[PDB]
Each structure stands twice: as structure tokens, then as C-alpha cells.
Amino acid sequence: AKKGAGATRGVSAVRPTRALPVGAYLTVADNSGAKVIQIIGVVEYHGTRRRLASAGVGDMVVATVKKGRPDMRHQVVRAVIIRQRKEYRRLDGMRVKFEDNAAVIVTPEGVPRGTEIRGPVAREAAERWVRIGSIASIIV
Amino acid sequence: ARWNVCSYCGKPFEPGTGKMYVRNDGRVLFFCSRKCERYYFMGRNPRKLKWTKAYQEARLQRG
Amino acid sequence: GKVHRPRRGSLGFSPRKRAKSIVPRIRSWPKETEVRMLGFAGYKAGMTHILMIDDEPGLTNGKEIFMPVTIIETPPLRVFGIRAYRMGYLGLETATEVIVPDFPLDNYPAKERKGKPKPKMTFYKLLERRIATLPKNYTQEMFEQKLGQLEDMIKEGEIVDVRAIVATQPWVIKLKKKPEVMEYAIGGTSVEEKFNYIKEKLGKELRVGEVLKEGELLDVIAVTKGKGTQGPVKRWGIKLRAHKDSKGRRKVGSIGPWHPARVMWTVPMAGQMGFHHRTELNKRLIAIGENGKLKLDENTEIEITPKGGFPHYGIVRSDFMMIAGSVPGAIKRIIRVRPAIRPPKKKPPVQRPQITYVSVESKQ
RNA sequence: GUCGAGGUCCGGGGCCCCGAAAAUGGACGGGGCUCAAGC
RNA sequence: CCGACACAGGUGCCCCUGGGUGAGAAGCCUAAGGCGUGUCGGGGGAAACCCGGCCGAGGGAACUCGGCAAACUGGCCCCGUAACUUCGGGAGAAGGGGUGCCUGCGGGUGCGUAACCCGCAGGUCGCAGUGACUAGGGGGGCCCGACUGUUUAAUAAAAA
RNA sequence: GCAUGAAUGGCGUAACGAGGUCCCCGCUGUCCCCGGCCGGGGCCCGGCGAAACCUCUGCCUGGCGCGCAUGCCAGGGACC
RNA sequence: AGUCGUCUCGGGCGAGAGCCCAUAUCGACCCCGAGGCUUGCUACCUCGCUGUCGGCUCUUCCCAUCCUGGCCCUGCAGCAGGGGCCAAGGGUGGGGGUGUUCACCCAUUAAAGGGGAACGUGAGCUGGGUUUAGACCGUCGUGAGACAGGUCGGAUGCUAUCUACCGGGGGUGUUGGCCGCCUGAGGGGAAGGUGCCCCUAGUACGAGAGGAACAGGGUGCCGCGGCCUCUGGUCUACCGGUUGUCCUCCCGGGCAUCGCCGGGCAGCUACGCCGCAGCCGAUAAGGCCUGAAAGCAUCUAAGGCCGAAGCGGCCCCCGAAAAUAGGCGGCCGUCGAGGGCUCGGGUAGAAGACCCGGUUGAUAGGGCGGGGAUGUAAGCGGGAAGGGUCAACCGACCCGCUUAGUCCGCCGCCCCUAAUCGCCCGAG
Ligand SMILES: [Zn+2]
């Protein structure tokens, strides 16, 4: 096998609804230095005519920093969505929804930029990105 | 296949239905219906409604 | 350059006209070696959901999962005809058809009203509501001669296929009295074997348990719910026009170029939507229940009917099927099922999956 | 140095082939035609 | 009456207006007075589509020449209010809190326990108290013209 | 300064403006992506009852042609 | 429209540049072409009017192929590149300034191809540019004024006659009429297309860095066809709260967008959920076997085997007007099978049509019961901040009878009511 302990990506059995289109504002839930980001694209996604790219929990998006430290503003970064307001169904059939739209800034390979994550982290995102779940304090 | 308990009406609801709400502090609530969820979030007192399990506790407290 | 996008809707279901008959037709049959009737019929009742331990290959294998199912009421069919097909110049041509003589009917739910005895129904009386011209002075001896002639033709070898003519029995479940008459193929490779299979059950009742196997994939054929006349936006999924359009928003903008100087048939237009003959592939048969009841673990038996009854439907009283997912058609619609004609390479095991919960709560 | 019947080159003539990709479906007038129903 | 008409225009709304809510000749309800003649009727899950209206999960201008249209705000009371300035203004800048009903007191003018208006304390209900109706969204740069005003009656209201 | 400029005025300017123009907070079906509901038409039945317009007619492909033919040539198809 | 100078795209020869080597790649100087996708030239049709650029919507076609499928050469170790061949089934997207087409830029992507259809599409839309009438600036003119110079504003008419396409009906014909079940000649389809991850494997290859593939598993997106169990939207059925006014007050009602607000089942829906075969057959480029012309050699001249997301079939939808106008069983005729109107209702619906029931009865109403939606009715008794002659009495609101009351375009049981009477066509 490859990347036994060094793996960064995992597989999730649940596909959350893509409820956050291009132009949505997300709250950064870690201490990387940014506070509010705006979605400008979604990786590993193909759209169609006149359709905006959308993403949900556990998805990596390209975002621009609107609020944060001066060395982080006006920067193009990659962020993984960890909390969304729109409810989505799990394997047992129950719906789950969160309080806000929150994401964590990571490198393109999936390594988080910050050192700690503030607030609960969705189980799907935790299993999709193992590095995020390692530093997450609350997983739900 | 476990019946959950609504956080507003206090009654169990069947598997495959209902919803789960997560607060920013990690606390988890269960809602059997949009009616219960909306009432809880808008602040309707569940201790004044006879169809709520909290009404029994309220009446016991009042005597 | 310009901007490309797939066309609106599919041209493989044209013309989008009303179905020729409310009773679905089956054009193709699967190839099987087992000698059994290739399909069944029933009436759509309603939908519910279960939680089951998944056994199909995939990521969620061995984990308890939510699963929507549809309940199809299947009272036993009456096998009353046998038809033989010879090879014509351009395809199969029916050579002869023999039906059984009239017999007393015992499953009719007769009720005592004020005055008069039991109606004492017999066959050829419910069938008359569909055929309306039935044999007169038809006798068991004459039926035997006709069957012998058909058998002799089979021995001579002029017959290349044989099929069974069956009729539904809605009076058993008190849905209605007019039956549906359908033709079904029989699996196998021997015309003699198929003929014996039909002959041994001529005039008898066939149950879904004796025909289909739990956990196998099926093709479901029915007529979809009618929607009446619908515009292109709903019919073909076109894009709404710009909000500043003063001539309307729910219409196609340009219906063609200057040349050709005609409207092409491919331009979306309003018309009939719904009530179309459709076939769905690879629907798993979750379970078969008897007398409106389902056994779970040899000590628990539950009534599949939800509290308050199915919406727009009565109470299930006869044998029923549990089909994973949704099926085309409305409530009380006649549904035909056949063994899957193009199943996937890695099919699920042919057995009932482990069911942990069945929803019987009120659906209204 | 052994077999044992025509090979070696060039310049020309006739027919044909390659060079030879376009937009509604289709043009030897059409069908079709090969010791022709072509030259 | 004029406009070819028993014409949704114009002449004439030219003169006049009970009660409640309310600052109000506002909106809404209602008394008097008038009308069912702003005159073709009947049917219908009887569609598509068009005109007029209401609502819409998550996102919030990614639409578009352009936030077109729609939406936010909205009355009253009390705190508070910037650059600039012709010192008059800007200004209701911006921004923040309150608003129902019931019980009981105090004050102003008043002979009055007549009428109007202004405060205080307590109790209590709902998601929401200017609960319907009425009813500003706001801020920062630049060009032009100082301002109020006038214009192509019938495609231009403007920097003319 | 291709080709500004001082009463065919030059520069600046508070207040003002259904004038043109850029940005920000808020807001929202403008949009992702469209879905429901209401009233009036549309539709059917009983009545009154016109007008614009009209050489005669009226299916296509490739062609000839005053050079983009329902009507011509060769084909294709078509019950009313 | 004609033409192709120009434009786009090829070809012939080979000076050379490439450590040797013209042809891995580039290919001077010259020479021969194809297309009508740029512009120009002519003035052949159209001035008793054929409405412009751009954008939106929608349909279709070509290949000179951007990606996806399969190959050949290489100055192709692998990962990649450069050049070329077959191949048009599918895809080729979202944004910033600008009226822009185009071009430039941003973040993704397998790639973000070029073109034709009266520079497709205004009896489909929009009206930002251009191209009237108003006005300003600069330049030119003595002047009126002008500018393929900028700038602000500046109208988009329609009752479909024929044909065309989408759906819905009545007839005749098919050698007498009617009911039912079938066959499938032909037509349509993309009903599917395409990424990523695990493992193979840190393996082949390579000094190292780096780094594949066959096979085997999983899954996303776009596209298509269905459904309402779960979730969300609506729900002018219904239930509750509340403002103004009117019916004298209580109850109960009208109007004010459904007055407003909250919830809301059935139905409809998507943001929800379910379903969509890789095998066979013949081939293109290409890789080979046998084999002479031409005693050798040779994939070709005869012959043979493999070989593509491309073609045909399996699959799905329409389909007896398929003019060779079909088959079979049954009933009827030489009074009469069968059918229509009328009747009670929707598995259906613009009119027609279609489907269930019609005393051979649970089709609708009604009664009773089940299930659900709101949220605890009116009336009475008690309490209540306080007032009141500290009495009687008033009092918003609260508690008990009370999971109440109200309602149900859902289900079950019961013939109590209406599904009755009647009329008409019909082959011989
Ligand atoms: Zn609850």
C-alpha cells in the first residue's frame, strides 16, 4: 500500500447537498489568520451552461480572503467546508444541519494551515480529510 | 433503528424521519418536525402547551 | 466561438403521446432456462420506507441504511388460456388459442343483502366485462379436443412458441370487478416443456410466491401519471426567457432558422405530458408478503398497511411485493413486472436482505 | 562458380491510380450498369 | 355637453360634507343619500400560455449595457449626529433604545369629579404591540448646471 | 495639450437635481433554478356580430433560372 | 450572386540549421493548388421598403479534431513532449473591465476547437452601439454649417389565410359486421458521456531525482427517464393569535391583499429520492501470416487472422394506412351480435377521447368508526397587580372540567338515498 500514515484524503459514504454556490461567504473556523472568505470556484466539479459551481460539507473550494490579517487579505486559498446551514441526509435517513457556513483553510494537498479548529466539525468532512479530523476537537 | 426523542415536544419519533441540529458549542438537539423546530427557535413556551411532554412537568411544579 | 450545451430533453421517447392502452404491453422477454412464467401483475398501493443491512456491493456494505420501497398488491392470477405461435414470413404468428370452459367462482366476496340469496358468481361472468363475447355451450370434452389438436400441432413441430393467457382478479381485493387479460411468456428451451407447464395450471390460480424469487432484480412496466397538456418548460426542461420579455417567459424563443423553411420536429413544443408507456430496469424485489402480512424473524409478523390505511387506497388483504425505490404509475394502477432483461454484472444475492425496521406509521 | 532462359537501361504512346477537405438528406436526369448499359 | 358613439378622455370637481381610528379634506370601516346600468350571461381542479397579485429552502447581483424590476427602511418619543460650508446649512446625516392591554396615582389650563394634553409605578399576553391601514433605505467620490422655474402638445425634461 | 485657457469667460465651490457616472453596508426570485397559490382571459355552451387582408393556388432534396421556387427538371413522400 | 488579388488551409524541390545526418523538428529562394469561414473587386437580382451590430432563447449541419476512443515516426529511458493517421457518438463550462464580435486577464477543467445555416434565429425577446429630429466640447468654415471625432437623451405595430412542426379527435378503405389478445415492416434514441480515488506500486524504467501500465475495486459530475416513503417550498381546504371598524354589549360574524402573523394534511413540486448492459458481428488507421509478379526479397497483386468512444444487433419509445392495407380465439348475419346518448364518479381530461361503477351494487352522498391538522372551544367555578363606603362590585390575564373544540379535496363498515326511466345507431 501507499501513504499508510501520510495519507491526507479519505472516503465518505455520505454525499452532502451542494448548497453553497459561487459567491457565498464562509466563516473561517481555524486560526490561520483569515476570518471571512468568499467562494470563487469548486475543484473536482464540472458544471453546465449558465450554472454556478456549488459545494457542500467535505468539499474543497477556491476562495478569496475578504477579512483577516493584512498578510492574508486579497489572497487566493483553498478551503474545506466543515459546516453548512442546509440540512442533508445521512445513511440512517436522518437529516442533519448546522448553525452557520464554516470552512477551514488548507493547502492544495489537504494539509490544514492552522493549528486548531474552533467549533464542531462534520463527520463527513472529518473522514474525507483525515488531517482535519486529527486536529478537530469536536466531531459530530 | 432507534426512535429518537424530540427536543421540543419530548416525544419519540421513528427512524428515518426527523432532523438533528448542531449548535456552535457542540450541543445536539433533535426535532421531530418543522413545527417543533420552528416553535423552539421562535421561542414559544413548551410548558404552556398541553400536547408537550414538558407540560406534565410544568403542572407538577405548579401543583 | 459559441457556447455548447446538451439539447433539452431526449428524442428517444417520441412521440410523447398518450399510451395506446392503460394495460401495459411487454415487447421483449428475458432468456431463461428455468421453466417458469416470466413475470407477474399487480396493483400499485403506496410507498413506505425501511431500514436494512445492505448486502449489495459498494461502499455502504454491511451498514444499516435507509431504503424507500413501494408496495404492490398481487392477488393470485387466473390462468385460463394457452396460445401457440408459429414462425411466419416476417415474424411470429399465432396459430391457435384454447381457453378453459366455464367453472364456478369461489373467491368472489358475495354478501347477503336484504332479500335474495348469495349471487353465486361463476367465471365467464367477470370475464364478460372484458371480452363480452364468450363461447356458448362450451364443454370439457370440446376443450379436451382443442387441447389435443394443439398438442398434435406441437408434436408435428409447426409451433415455435407457447404463451399463457392470464386474467387478474380484482374482486378478491375488492378493488373492482373488470379484470385485465394479459399474455405471459414461459422460460425454458423446450416447447413441449412449456406446454406441459401451462397445461398443468390451466384453469388454476398462480401466486407471486410460486413465480418470483425474493431479492432478485425486475423490470417494471406501467403507464405513468398523467399531467395533461404541459408547456415546453416542464415538458422538455427549457430555460425561462429573460425577465424583461414582454411576450412571455415560459416559451421557446426561436423555433427555427430561416432555412430549412419549416419547423423541425426537434423543436420543443407543448403537448401531452404523462400517461406514457415506460419501462424501469433493475428494481430489486425486497420481500414477498402473504395475506397483507410480513414475517420478520419467525416470531414477529406485521401488517404492511400503515395506520389509517394507504392514501387513496384501501387495505392490503392479499399477497404483495416490496419493490426497492419507486415505480411508474398512479395509485391503483395496473403494474407488470418481469425478470430483469439487462441486469448488472455484479448483481446482489438472490435472497431477502436483513430488515431491521419497517415503517407502518400514518402516511397522511 | 555453380546452376541454365531471356534479362538489363533509356526515351515515349493509351487507359487507370495517388496527390483530392464543407456545411438541410441526394444526384451520371434517375434506376442501375464491369468480355458494360464505360472508353 | 364636446370628442363620428349609451367614447375609461376633456369640459366641471365649479360650490358643500355626519361617526370611529387617526395630526389630518390621508388610508380603512360605517350612518344619510345613491346604486347593482363604470350592463352579455352559464360551465369548470376545464389544461398550456398571457395579464394583475402572494409566497418561496441555501447563496446573496454570480443576472444585466446598467441592481431594470422587486426587495430593505418606514409613524411617534428619547439619547446621538461627520467631512465640508456662502455660518444660513448639511440634518430626519449616520447610529442606538422604547411603543400593546389592564390596575392605580401625579401634573398643566380649567369653578369643575366637563374637555384636551403630558408623566409615573405595578401586573400581564403573543413569534410579532406605528400588529391591519398609514408609513424615508442609507453612505462615500467624480462631471455638468448655482438655486425655485421653462421647453420639443404626439419617440428627446436635459449638461438645453 | 493631434486639436485647453481666461466674460463665445478660467479655476474653485456650500446648498440644490425624476441629469450622466464609480464604489460600500443592507436588501432581495435579477440569477444558480425554478416550484406552488389567487383573481381575470384563454377553453366549452346560449346570444349579438365585424375588420385587416385575399391573382389562382399552396409538401420536400439537388438543380436550371432576373443568380434564395408550394407551382419548372430528376427524384422522395403524402388516405380525407 | 460571379471572382479569389487578399485571407484560411495544404502540396512539389531541397540551400541549409540540427555534434555525423535535408527530411525527429524547422525548412530559405522558387513553383502548383483547395475552401468560400477575412477583406477587396464587378454591379447580375432586390429601391410602389426582404427591418441593422451585439446579447438571450432554441434547433441543426461540416471537419481542416481542442478533450474523450485506437494507432505510426521520434534527437520516444519513465513522467512527459514534437510531428502525423483513422475517427464527428459525446463534451467543449463559470467570471472582470468594454455595446462590443474578437482580443486580454482570473479561478477551475479531460479540454475549456474553428466554422455554415439570408454575417441561422426582432409576425421570439432586449435595445447597450450604429443611423433622424434636442444639446455640449474640440477642430475646420466669413457664414448658414460639417466631422467613418467624442459625449447625455431619443418609439420596436399582429384577431394566422395556406403550409410547417407539437399534441388531441371524427370518418372512409383494408371485398359482411363486432369484442378481445397479439405480430412488428419501417421510423426515433446518447440514453448514456466523462473525471477522480484505492490497489497494482514507490513496482517497471531511471545514476539519482522522479515515476508508469494490464487486470481488480469505489465514487463524483453532466445528461436522460420516473416517484412523493424522508427533507424542503407552496398549500386564498382547515385550525389558532391579533389590529382598525361595523353588526348595542357576551357568543358569533362582514370588510380591510387570504387584513396581517404562526403552523398546516391531501395535491403539485425540487433543493428530496429511485433507475440507466457491456457482450456479440463486420470494419477504418495500424500490427501480421502465406505468397508470386521479379528462381531472392516482399502485409497485396489472388487469399487469410487480428484490430476503434466510430457502424449493425441485443435494450427502450411510436407503430395494421405496413396498398403484400396482418394473425388467432369467440359471438353474430346471409329479427339481429355489438355499440352510442343518458346515470353515479376519476387511476383521465382545453372540446373530443380514456378509466372504474351502475341493484350480477359499496360509485357518490349520509351515519358510525380509524387516521390526521391545528392547539385546549363556549359556559361555569376559583385566583389575580390593585381599586372600591378597603362592603357589594369591576378587573387584563391565569388555573380546572379539556389531548378539548373545530375541521379534513384520506381510509374502513352499513344499501338509508341517488346510480332509474327512456331514446338512437347497427352488418344482412
Ligand atoms: Zn417534536
mmCIF file of N, CA and C and ligand atoms in Angstrom, chain B residues 6 9 32-33 36, ligand 1:
data_model
loop_
_atom_site.group_PDB
_atom_site.id
_atom_site.type_symbol
_atom_site.label_atom_id
_atom_site.label_comp_id
_atom_site.label_asym_id
_atom_site.label_seq_id
_atom_site.Cartn_x
_atom_site.Cartn_y
_atom_site.Cartn_z
ATOM 1 N N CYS B 6 -37.746 14.068 20.460
ATOM 2 C CA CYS B 6 -37.761 15.471 20.071
ATOM 3 C C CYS B 6 -37.363 16.355 21.244
ATOM 4 N N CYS B 9 -41.148 18.744 21.864
ATOM 5 C CA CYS B 9 -42.338 18.080 22.375
ATOM 6 C C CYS B 9 -42.023 16.906 23.291
ATOM 7 N N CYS B 32 -38.559 16.474 15.754
ATOM 8 C CA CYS B 32 -39.419 15.535 15.048
ATOM 9 C C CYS B 32 -40.108 16.158 13.845
ATOM 10 N N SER B 33 -40.277 17.476 13.827
ATOM 11 C CA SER B 33 -40.992 18.117 12.735
ATOM 12 C C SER B 33 -40.564 19.570 12.622
ATOM 13 N N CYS B 36 -42.130 21.707 15.393
ATOM 14 C CA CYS B 36 -41.390 21.734 16.650
ATOM 15 C C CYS B 36 -40.115 22.557 16.525
HETATM 16 ZN ZN ZN H 1 -41.495 17.370 18.357
#
